Symmetry: D2
Subunit: 475 residues, 4 copies
């Protein structure tokens, strides 16, 4: 028996679990053949995956380097200390002014850990409204229900876009903050295509004596490469995912000011008071054992973030998105805020006479992965009028500007098919659209042809994290 | 561009030799040590290959067939398969039980259950942390709320019977009458006996409280059917997917669904756990699922069904029984006098030395254990015991006579710690550490014992990697 | 028109509102002719009533003496300062160790103001369970509902009697407090016939670092007279009503420690930190303008509480209750805890085969005013009757008179048992129907009512003149 | 026989007059009677209570414990207390012309501030959201209040509050900004209630915002309830879900409070189901057993008396005179060069913005008080801090109760103006510019002290000519 469970523990995935091996092979082929346009997605490196898939997973290491509860952590401590050092270096941070926690398991709990560290239950948070481009982990409630648990345990109130311009209305944010008295203001967005006015947020936070939290998950790779302005110039605390544009493993980091803050009226120094509170909220407050395999892969990703090739990549992300936006506009699409200054665009489909749910169904069938998105002017939250698309993932595969001009063309062809399906549907409900989409032989053929166009275009580019020659599903 | 694509596809050895070397050092450490921390295990190569796969690249907020992002055909296959195998691993009828496989680890899994089923500041009871509980069930000292569970909810501990070392269920029941908990946790970390799940169920019924079983430490024993199952009684069951399950680092949340018992049907006839728990996980508290972990979890759960896995968990139990017997015969006192599971709790009081001193010597001779509070301790900062268990070394093929050897080397390390204390000048721990580092004679004793430990441990297979390709073979 | 509203403003109640004047005359007759046994009730002095019914009501005086928001408060300040100083004197308190707030409007908000001052929302309070003798203003919840809003805004947990002895189970209180970690423990009761073990509460509060709040509303006049042990030796804060056994106007006082508390391990003085928090919770926290007419009447009541005849009154309250208890016991009644050490008794009627609701209905019809009370096994109708001596002692009832009160109570119970036996159904509404329709039992109740009224009528009226009453028959 | 002598002594003590028992307290009351005879009482929340109300408040109704509600008590003896509370409820609905099938009332709340807290406790969970007029803009502490330093009102501790504000360019509530703020803040309850505000509420607009937000509309009419009862201004009951009020202030009753609430059908929803109002049981249970204990039956009985008075033609004539006096007061102030916040008044008070006179409200209030004119400093738009108020608040209810008519309030404005001129002389004679230098000059300048002495004598000689309210001049201890 004992020889038999040892053989099981050392066998390959192919031998032990052909069903799971097959699923992974199908997903590899999907990442080879598709336009991956979800702006939060990316393709991580082989070296990160090998670290995440390593025996670093086996160790329990509650606590912090040199201050653990378990023994045996000499090399786990090396990895976590190396990760912290590289995290500060990736954002060009002075370690006497900034510290970092690398144990938070993902972006959503990272924000909750900051709130738990710095706010009592039911204290007040302001953030960008979710339908205006915010994120659930900053709070969200509808008329009838608290949707994010941040809005259960803390008191949240949104700030909004200027409806005319599509940019954050900073004047209204400031006026709202006078009345609401937030103890923390979030400067961070998901579906927002413009740069944050961090200086203005800093002025509001100073006036309100509120914590300035920058949540840079969508843009952290752009920040690390220095191709957009840094929130670290202004923020008190910065959270981020380690995946998305950073191109690391799935995880998170929390950065915070430390050391001298200012001098009081009595000539006494006043120190920042974030580090101990945040580290203790992460552990023992809310998490248990760190995921050392992820932390080890994060250290790899943060070293990669320093290279000239990584900066060239992020510069290309920006140039690709600008050309993508330009081409969409030329083809008659409307963009929220009229364009982009970062890695994504927000298409408002209202002028085309069709909603994002119908378009996204066609996109899925032609192997264009995007996501439907609420846009300003939407009546129902469950009928999004927009589509969110971005450049990090396909830029990682080597798409350049002319390639994203073609992506915009193929998107437009998919919208035109969607409009044809709608024109052929009897009813106006989405189930009538879907039934037409699955019974109309002419339009099925058009979708099949566009699918082949998309796959033929995407397949020519390199695969990231695996080699084409050993793919099980080449056809 | 050809340049950055090349860096994305290069091996770890080429891209990051410093990190590669840390992993090689850790491989050698797992080869050469007695790993006795009862929450640790060695995961299979196949799980690691799934966790290290391109499944990590996908955003898939929502649930299978109810996503917000496109492109999730195959991620849906993996999550659906994972759920199916999770119910199968614990022999659960899918018309009566559901599962959420997206919770990132054991501690947030419990918080997500509380968020789903309790309003802020509602009341939870659970085993006291120094009595064998866990921080994710709440914990407050005289001066500070330590777990944020005790910040957002109102917690109260239940305790051991100090004379027997078992949970004092009579006191729990009386305490609950006054405190009126909305949820009672049946789950422990440093506890060597089986839970009286039937008694917890009786108390929860009387109190109209949710019965949450947190089986993180024992879930692999449960899956193999070698100890009684909390699913016989509980409303909700949380677990880590690592520890005795031997899966990736992650968590599962199981919950009753469908029709309630005849005598519990009222305004609603159906259980009201599934939607609340799934919604607390997403959109409540998490974002994108970690599909690489979910896929590795599917692999681990298939392994959990096999006869080899049942043989493994049988061996875990028989090893721990033998380990306990050998320790008792060498004079060690065990909390509750023995074990019924994967771990033992040594109370070092009868030896005249505390757990902090012994653990330092153990660490120096490559034996990984944990200092542990024992009934009778005056301070939670000065633990009088040591916790040790059998899952990790049993995975490497240790059997009963091997754990007799483990107990022998543990005993020799305690004898060395007692000598360091005798040679120590002062009474404080820094004087002990000063002796432990400066005494040439005792430094030699620890070196010799470290060699004995490593020579014994090296004879066994490495788990999840090959000896032949290790960088550090000495 | 001007002369028209001036006349209305200066006219007597008899001229302006004959209906209200008649209600008051009916109530005077009720207080003259009955056995008023509700232990929280008393008869207030004429001088207090004259102050409460004075033009002191007109001034707005938010803030505190010498620190008001509005002008014109010179004489309001004289009254409130005098009230405060007399309040400390009434309990023989050192004003360097004790302060007082006299603005709280009644006993229930006084406790809420203390919690608001000293505890954050959702922090923990222990107090005597309401059906075990506690009070709603210390918190209370059933299995299904939070009844007191104290239990909404704060996290409450009860302590209970030893139901074998009827005394508070201090052993279980102490063990519960270890697990529950209260920030504040209340030592105060309503339906409880025994003295509190304040020293034991102090020991538990010291161990838990909890605020010790004594709520002496039921017993404060006994404390003021020095005829039972004082909670002020032990407590951090003391709340009380100003009515009930103190015999003042309807209102409340909050007392708190101030000044030096102890020396810490570092040789540093640590001061009490209750005074500013409590004063600020009362105003601007939770109340607005003080009721200066009530505060002025309170000053009058506190002067009375100093006098020798007030002490003689409270000593008589105790002796009357002891005799009442002894007589009930001799007539075969069981008392919760077996007797009394204060102003009330708790009769457990279960050994007589009838409940408190049925008995209280008969008592009401024979002009005996009493309260009901739960006993072991209850909740449905309560099994007990609560009766006390402060009100009738104020009218001059002495020991032989309360022996008579116990006789007439016993006669009422015997009538209630006859109604129960004649009632051919088992429901309370069947009892009421029999009680209202049975001519013979109505005759027995009329006779006992006449006996009660004839006995009570001979004692002085308190606060008004018999000779000028409208209803002299 | 010492025991019988003691018993006779304590009975004698209980039946003796205040003059006999406590001459020190009796003396204080006599001083306060003289003070109420001699002053210009312009604080708009103050009034003079009738003798009949005071006689009921000072009655043996105080002796009864009556927890619960009429006919639903917990213990005996309450036949006549029930008559009083039932009569009080009936008269409360009648005083505001309310249909008892559409409105109920609770008359047990002990004062205006706990009445509002009881409504919040009844209708909102802890930490749910309330909006109300900002305290420096005319609001009240019992609606919530927080500064940059700390939470001041405990309403802001137990509930989550946010203010709405005036349009400081017009002096009116900025309803547009209220509506926009409410969209973001999502209040569960909005208070329509003001103290230091010279205008009436746009209840129709508050109703529209509450309907859009599915929020409870609470009108807190403490300052105006007597005007409402007399029908001389529009009623909040046309629109509000719940109405709280003090029973003192312009109602001219005892110190206490009332809570009114809708009953019956709210709407038929989209599924065709009747939605009933759910206020009565929640509010009555928040008052008892939630937050209070034994009702104060002396106050409830005096409230019944005050509510009967509120229905009379003489009371309506009184409230009409309150409004006419305030308009005449405002005319005279404008004619003498004063600026009024919002440009005028629609009610019982005025808010004078003193900025164009070159002196602030603290300085003027101090001089007014020395000449026995009672008024209150008041924040005005443009003030540097809430601690340096630029205005002064004055009203007509109390002196109108003593029979001041329009020509008398023209005289009050003249004497106010004379006090302002003295304050300006004190400021021009002051060494420094801080308030303490003003107070120093005010207390040592023999000439200006003499001017204030003369003005005080003018004020008192004018006020003394009017009837005293609630007591007789002939029996006063202090007749000069
Ligand atoms: Cl996205
Ligand atoms: Cl462990
Ligand atoms: Cl009582
Ligand atoms: Cl006012």
């Amino acid at each position: 028996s004992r020889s038999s469970w040892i053989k099981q523990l050392n066998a390959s995935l192919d031998e032990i679990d052909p069903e799971v091996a097959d699923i992974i092979e199908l997903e590899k082929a999907r990442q080879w053949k598709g336009f991956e346009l979800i702006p939060s997605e990316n393709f991580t490196s082989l070296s990160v995956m090998q670290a995440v898939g390593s025996v670093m997973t086996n160790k329990y290491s509650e606590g912090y380097p040199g201050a653990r509860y378990y023994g045996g952590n000499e090399y786990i401590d090396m990895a976590e200390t190396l990760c912290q050092k590289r995290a500060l270096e990736a954002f060009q941070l002075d370690p006497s002014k900034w510290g970092v926690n690398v144990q938070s398991l993902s972006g959503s709990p990272a924000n909750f850990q900051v709130y738990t560290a710095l706010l009592k239950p039911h204290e007040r948070i302001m953030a960008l409204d979710l339908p205006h481009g915010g994120h659930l982990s900053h709070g969200y409630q509808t008329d009838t229900k608290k949707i994010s648990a941040v809005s259960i345990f803390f008191e949240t109130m949104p700030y909004r876009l200027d409806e005319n311009t599509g940019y954050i209305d900073y004047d209204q944010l400031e006026k709202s903050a006078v009345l609401f008295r937030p103890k923390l203001i979030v400067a961070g967005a998901s579906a927002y295509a413009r740069l944050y006015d961090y200086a203005r947020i800093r002025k509001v936070c100073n006036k309100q004596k509120a914590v300035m939290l920058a949540d840079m998950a969508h843009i952290s790779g752009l920040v690390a490469a220095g191709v957009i302005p840094s929130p670290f110039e202004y923020a008190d605390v910065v959270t981020t995912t380690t995946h998305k544009s950073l191109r690391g493993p799935r995880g998170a980091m929390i950065f915070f000011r430390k050391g001298l803050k200012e001098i009081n009226k009595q000539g006494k120094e006043v120190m920042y008071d974030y580090e101990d509170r945040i580290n203790q909220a992460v552990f023992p407050g809310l998490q248990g054992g760190p995921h050392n395999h992820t932390i080890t892969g994060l250290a790899v990703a943060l070293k990669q973030a320093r290279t000239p090739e990584y900066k060239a990549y992020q510069d290309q992300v920006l140039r690709n998105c600008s050309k993508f936006a330009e081409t969409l506009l030329a083809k008659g699409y409307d963009l929220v805020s009229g364009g982009t200054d970062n890695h994504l665009v927000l298409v408002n489909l209202k002028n085309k006479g069709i909603d994002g749910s119908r378009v996204e169904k066609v996109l899925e069938l032609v192997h264009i992965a995007a996501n439907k998105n609420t846009v300003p002017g939407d009546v129902s939250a469950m009928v999004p009028g927009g589509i969110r698309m971005g450049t990090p993932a396909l830029t990682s595969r080597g798409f350049i500007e002319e390639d994203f001009a073609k992506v915009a063309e193929y998107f437009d062809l998919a919208v035109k098919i969607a409009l044809k399906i709608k024109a052929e549907s009897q009813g106006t409900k989405l189930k009538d659209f879907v039934a037409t989409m699955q019974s109309n032989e002419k339009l099925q053929s058009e979708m099949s042809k566009l699918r082949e166009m998309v796959e033929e275009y995407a397949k020519q580019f390199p695969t990231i994290g695996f080699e084409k020659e050993t793919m099980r599903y080449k056809e």
